[PDB]
Amino acid sequence: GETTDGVYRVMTRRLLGSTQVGVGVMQEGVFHTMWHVTKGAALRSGEGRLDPYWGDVKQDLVSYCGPWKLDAAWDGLSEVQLLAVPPGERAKNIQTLPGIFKTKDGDIGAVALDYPAGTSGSPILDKCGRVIGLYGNGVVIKNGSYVSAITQGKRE
Amino acid sequence: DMYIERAGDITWEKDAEVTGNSPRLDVALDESGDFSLVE
Ligand SMILES: CNCc1nnc2ccccn12
Secondary structure (H helix, E strand, C coil): CCCCCEEEEEEECCCCCCEEEEEEEEECCEEEECHHHHCCCCEEECCEEECEEEEECCCCEEEECCCCCCCCCCCCCCCEEEEECCCCCCCEEEEECCEEEEECCEEEEEECCCCCHHHCCCEEECCCCCEEEECCCEEECCCCCEEEECECCCCC | CEEEEEEECCCCCCCCEECCCCCEEEEEECCCCCEEECC
């Protein structure tokens, strides 16, 4: 199947028609997505099969074909871009200045952009095009709006 | 059964649409990977 670097839609034919359940990043031959998108299930790319390699429900991340490769981090100051891949719609870059999720274990960047749930797994990029995390695990605030963490894995 | 389809290259785009605010929120992360607001 296709192993070229880039952003990919994650689809299923289990429900009515073809439904986009999420998005992911192919980098260095490894596909990266959020755990809640696939629930750790195997994926197909044309005739090829991608098997899960590493996953963690608490981080809400999973990698296929190899270990997690994304290790760039938000600098805590600059604007970033969400490369949103919405269901049935073209990939589109949206620039924003992240907020912060403050936790008992440290601070994490957060993007206040609201997209359909099937956009989860879309990468967040720094000014050099490096993936600093994936969009799609977050919270609903007072006003009903959605705020996602910039969720990044660890490259061993 | 789940399958993947390419949707694009990963690149920064100059003069992309600029939107969204920057909220500072107190949050908690549970064992199930769910974030919640702390007040
Ligand atoms: C797929 N479940 C996570 C989730 N629940 N609401 C939203 C909204 C946007 C992105 C992700 N979201």
